[PDB]
Design a protein around this ligand. Sequence first.
Ligand SMILES: CC(=O)N[C@H]1[C@@H](OP(=O)(O)OP(=O)(O)OC[C@H]2O[C@@H](n3ccc(=O)[nH]c3=O)[C@H](O)[C@@H]2O)O[C@H](CO)[C@@H](O)[C@@H]1O
Length: 419
Amino acid sequence: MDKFRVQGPTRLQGEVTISGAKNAALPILFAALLAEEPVEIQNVPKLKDIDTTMKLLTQLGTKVERXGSVWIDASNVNNFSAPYDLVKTMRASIWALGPLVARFGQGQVSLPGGCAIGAAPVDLHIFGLEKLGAEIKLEEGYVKASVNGRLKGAHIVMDKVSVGATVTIMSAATLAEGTTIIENAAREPEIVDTANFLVALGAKISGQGTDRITIEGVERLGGGVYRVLPDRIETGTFLVAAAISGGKIVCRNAQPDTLDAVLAKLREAGADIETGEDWISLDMHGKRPKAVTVRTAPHPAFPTDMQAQFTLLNLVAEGTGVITETIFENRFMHVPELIRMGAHAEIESNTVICHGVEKLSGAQVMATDLRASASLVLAGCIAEGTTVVDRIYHIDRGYERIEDKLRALGANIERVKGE
Ligand SMILES: CC(=O)N[C@H]1[C@@H](OP(=O)(O)OP(=O)(O)OC[C@H]2O[C@@H](n3ccc(=O)[nH]c3=O)[C@H](O)[C@@H]2O)O[C@H](CO)[C@@H](O)[C@@H]1O
């Protein structure tokens, strides 16, 4: 089991080029199942999740290749089942379901359990699919979908905001008969990205980015070329990296507009931030961050995907900070890890009360999920001494070359083996 050996403290400064959004490349890769014609998805990050996705696609009968871009040929998709062995490591696997039934009249996906930040119920996916006319069956640890003829447009009122379900529903609706309305749709930039991708294929979608998405189904989707938007969470992660280390950083290939809340939060922490068309600069001026209050919520609010990072920020900030996680139920795994590093925090249900300390101490800590893993590595960067982050495979799933990137920023980091 690989681990990150990190030597701190090290001020994180310099530049980083933001990779394509894992969160947009994923739903787009899946949406590509809808494409009858060649598809080119550009700016796709090199992540384990992308590999897993590519493998899954291939299993379905998709022709897939990659470098920067991922080339997809789903003309011959002829296998409508995503087996446990292929979906097991990735919650996003559910995305194969919608495209499959929407295009093929049938699909089945083994239910992945998802990472420990919280359960992965897919009731909203099923809900929307059912609304679209699909018959859903939960059997054999599988979610089975079918429909006679085409899916049918429907007015789908989402009682909960779901990034994943919004993608499934939006995607599936592009092939439905008639118009679909997704009320209370997730607004995430990844939804906009996926919607734009769909449109590039011939889909009729509007309202993406707003709480109301309108899809006018079409008989079939063609092909196209689409560039995945920058990874806002990667961007936020690097920003925080500088923000907690008294550093200065410039994020290249960034999309400032996808980070309003995070940037404002960083400003609250005292960061000197500037933004350009495709870049974001953060300058701490050697300053310690100021503690902040964070309430995660659906886009455009503060992203739960920045939660662990901000917890860290608070933990080394000046003052008492409060972080409320409203999206996931088990997303405080990083807290004990950080406390082992000398952090001071109390958890009250979905809120973590942070008491920033001047300095962390290197420790043996364990990555439990994507964001937390990255958080721990950052903590190792600024902590005094040696930090060993175990199970970095977590980070490999969703970060492209974080090791290289961190190194380029001055981090003393090493990937080691040994369970
Ligand atoms: C691959 C990808 O893009 N992952 C992101 C996506 O995941 P994900 O799509 O899983 O996020 P959701 O928005 O759907 O989940 C939000 C909340 O809704 C619940 N829920 C979701 C679906 C459903 O059918 N029923 C249900 O109860 C969840 O378990 C959680 O408690 O959005 C999250 C919220 O910004 C991010 O943190 C994840 O990194």
